[PDB]
Structure 1
Amino acid sequence: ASVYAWNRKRISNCVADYSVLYNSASFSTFKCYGVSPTKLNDLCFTNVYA
């Protein structure tokens, strides 16, 4: 979407490696807040929204 009208995707009932993401040279920025980017593989969440 255009940024005035951003999509939200519910992510649920699934497993996620984040190292495939944070190891990639593609990301010109990858901030995390209240969690470490490296630590995401050691945690669970009720849902995630992208």
Structure 2
Amino acid sequence: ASVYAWNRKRISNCVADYSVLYNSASFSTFKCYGVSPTKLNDLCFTNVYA
């Protein structure tokens, strides 16, 4: 979608492997603010939104 109508998707009831996002070189910017990128596999979340 365009930036004025940005698409928001809820993520819930799943086990997430974030290691495929860090180890992928396709992303020019992979920048996390309130959490370390390498600790994402060690934590549990709710209210996940993309």
Provide TM-score, normalisation by structure 1.
0.94
Q: Distance in 1 between matches of 2:34 and 2:47?
A: 16
Q: Partners in 2 of 1:23 and 1:38 — Cα distance?
A: 10
Identity %: 100
Q: What's the offset of the Cα at 1:34?
A: 1.1
Deviation at 1:15, TM superposition (A): 0.5
**TM-score in terms of structure 2 length:** 0.94
Q: Runs of 5+ in structure 1 lacking a partner?
A: none
Q: Quick one: distance in 2 between partners of 1:46 and 1:24?
A: 24
**1:2 Cα deviation (Å)?**
0.7
Q: CA deviation at 1:46?
A: 1.6
Q: Which of structure 1's runs of 4+ aligned residues deviate more than 4 A?
A: none
Q: Which position in structure 2 is the counterpart of 1:48? A: 48
Helix, strand or coil at the partner of 1:39: helix
Number of aligned residue pairs: 50
